[PDB]
Design a protein around this ligand. Structure first.
Ligand SMILES: NC(=O)c1ccc[n+]([C@@H]2O[C@H](COP(=O)([O-])OP(=O)(O)OC[C@H]3O[C@@H](n4cnc5c(N)ncnc54)[C@H](OP(=O)(O)O)[C@@H]3O)[C@@H](O)[C@H]2O)c1
Ligand SMILES: NC(=O)c1ccc[n+]([C@@H]2O[C@H](COP(=O)([O-])OP(=O)(O)OC[C@H]3O[C@@H](n4cnc5c(N)ncnc54)[C@H](OP(=O)(O)O)[C@@H]3O)[C@@H](O)[C@H]2O)c1
Ligand SMILES: [Cl-]
Ligand SMILES: [Cl-]
Lengths: 214, 214
């Protein structure tokens, strides 16, 4: 059972992820910007709460941690300034802090669209570049990484069933946030998933079996 | 005499740079987004004009080129989306295109503030990260690079006199855009400046002598 720091722990995927990690026998440590978000994240599955901000010194957050999941993001309501500062620069600093501390296991929540950002919708291209460049920083690191690139996210209830590819030639489906969380929790302690980058949609294959074959 | 592609050739520094390169015996090739900008850049010193856009396929621009100067930028009037897409992603693609083609000589026009972007003014921090990460991409490349980090830019007339440092412990001065252009033109064909990153302010030392000692 790993102590897993969830960076971005108040987000929609992350919230589900706290519960998925708990029920896999892990100890989810939720990182939050303000202390008042903590009580409900404990109800959702967090073992511990750490109050830290990616824009400030957040090194204290990484104390006694076995694995990091980067699930943070600025979102569609803050500017492209925050896409740079959170999704890209924040991720880069989380990676450096994990190396510094010797935390080997790192799961990146990325996105489809990142293999070829210049072919993505112009209105999204800045986001896709930010995600891509963060992925590349992880790929250049010494960490035991896995990069999960979900398709378009939905808020439907979990199906428990997905499809994966190193890279789909087209994206014609969505994935529920519940199911992304399930995928991450399934692979956090799977050594055979180290060094893997994959895209994930809802589909027909049970999540446990998909992860077995990654 | 080198054929020097000036990326961002319609900008304020770049415009002066066309003339500085010409009068050093180089052939400045101005890259512009639209053809109508070309006639005046020829008057300012350009030997040739190439019409290309960093957001589209611009590989044709790099034909018959000996050196690249990246002097492009989104500016304070477009969004942080364009800081990502031009200053960072555009630079990254220019670097890749230079490697692809075997163009060895690359001069980056960067900025002070990049050694420690989190200590810079919050309103500028996204820009400083973009510049920093572009600099790091160049530093990881196989190119014969020089990175010039000017201080705050001014539109005063050239003094011809500067101060340099690997990194100033404080910035209490500006530098004219004329003088930045002079610095770049001075070092483009100087082999001893390869692998050098430095900050540059106006000061007391003639530009030729500063470059001799880099
Ligand atoms: N939308 C899509 O269709 C789509 C597609 C592919 C990939 N994705 C990616 O999937 C990820 C997870 O999705 P999601 O729906 O869970 O996103 P979300 O609900 O926006 O989660 C983002 C979290 O990041 C946190 N955060 C923001 N700034 C922070 C900072 N400075 N320090 C620490 N935390 C900070 C937020 O905190 P607060 O609670 O304080 O706001 C929020 O809880 C996204 O981040 C996105 O990049 C999305
Ligand atoms: N302001 C400061 O105090 C300061 C301090 C330190 C460093 N700097 C850096 O110094 C650099 C040079 O300064 P400057 O004053 O010459 O800037 P500038 O006048 O804004 O020059 C930027 C140029 O980039 C071009 N450009 C924009 N998008 C492009 C694209 N997609 N493809 C090709 N070209 C594109 C613009 O073209 P158009 O002519 O079509 O607009 C413009 O000519 C800046 O880029 C900045 O990063 C500035
Ligand atoms: Cl793609
Ligand atoms: Cl600095």
């Amino acid at each position: 059972g790993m102590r897993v720091l969830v960076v971005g722990a108040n987000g929609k995927v992350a919230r589900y992820l706290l519960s998925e990690l708990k029920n896999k026998g892990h100890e989810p440590v939720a990182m939050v910007r303000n202390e008042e978000q903590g009580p409900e994240l404990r109800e959702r599955g967090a073992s511990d709460i750490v109050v830290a901000n990616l824009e400030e010194d957040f090194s204290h957050a990484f104390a006694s941690i076995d694995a990091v999941v980067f699930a943070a993001g600025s979102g569609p309501h803050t500017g492209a300034d925050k896409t740079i500062l959170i999704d890209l620069w924040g991720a880069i600093k989380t990676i450096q802090e994990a190396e510094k501390r010797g935390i080997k296991r790192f799961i990146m929540v990325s996105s489809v669209g990142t293999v070829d950002p210049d072919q993505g919708p112009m209105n999204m291209r800045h986001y896709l570049v930010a995600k891509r460049l963060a992925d590349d920083e992880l790929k250049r690191s010494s960490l035991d990484y896995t990069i999960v690139r979900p398709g378009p996210l939905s808020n439907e209830e979990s199906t428990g069933k997905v499809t994966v590819s190193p890279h789909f030639s087209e994206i014609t489906r969505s994935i529920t946030r519940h199911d992304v969380a399930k995928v991450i929790a399934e692979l956090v302690d799977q050594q055979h998933t180290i060094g893997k980058t994959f895209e994930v949609l809802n589909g027909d294959t049970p999540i446990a079996k998909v992860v077995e074959q990654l």
